[PDB]
Amino acid sequence: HQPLIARDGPHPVEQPVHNYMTKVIDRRALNAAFSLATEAIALLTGEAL
Amino acid sequence: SPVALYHQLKTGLHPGFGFTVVRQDRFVTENVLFSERASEAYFLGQLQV
């Protein structure tokens, strides 16, 4: 709701454009990963004990 | 010749000399194993596949 400094003189009239402007959200990935070896698969489950 | 000596033996005639025979029989036997009390070591481990 922008201000108005509504004028004197015969210059024509101010008009409040109380507009709704939109925006747009982006989308991002942010990916991460980690290894796991060929052992510790039987381990951390209960196979090779 | 080897050809002549093929041709003398089937008829049957002693060709100036003789031979010797070397061969191999084989015999399955039941052996007997005495042991002393404390001889071997034979340790043990762990079981998983």
Instruction: Dump the DSSP string for chain A.
Output: --------SSS--------------------------SSSSSTTTTS--
- How would you label B20-39 residue by residue, b for 16+ Cβ within 10 Å and e otherwise? eeeeeeeeeeeeeeeeeeee
Rounded to the nearest angstrom, the minimum Cα separation between B44 and chain A is 16
Is A48 touching B (CB cutoff 8 A)? yes
Q: Roughly how many angstroms between the first and final C-alpha of chain B, as a whole number? A: 67
Is A46 touching B (CB cutoff 8 A)? no
Task: Name the nearest CA neighbour of A36 among A26, A44, A27.
Answer: A44
Residue B6 one-letter amino acid:
Y
Structure-solving method: cryo-EM
Which 8-state DSSP code applies to residue B10? T
Deposited resolution, Å? 5.4
Cα–Cα distance for residue pair B46/A39, rounded to 1 Å: 17
Cα–Cα distance for residue pair A14/A4, rounded to 1 Å: 7
Cα–Cα distance for residue pair B33/B40, rounded to 1 Å: 14
Cα–Cα distance for residue pair A15/A5, rounded to 1 Å: 10
Q: What is the largest CA-CA distance in chain A?
A: 95
Rounded to the nearest angstrom, the minimum Cα separation between A33 and chain B is 30
Residue A35 one-letter amino acid:
S
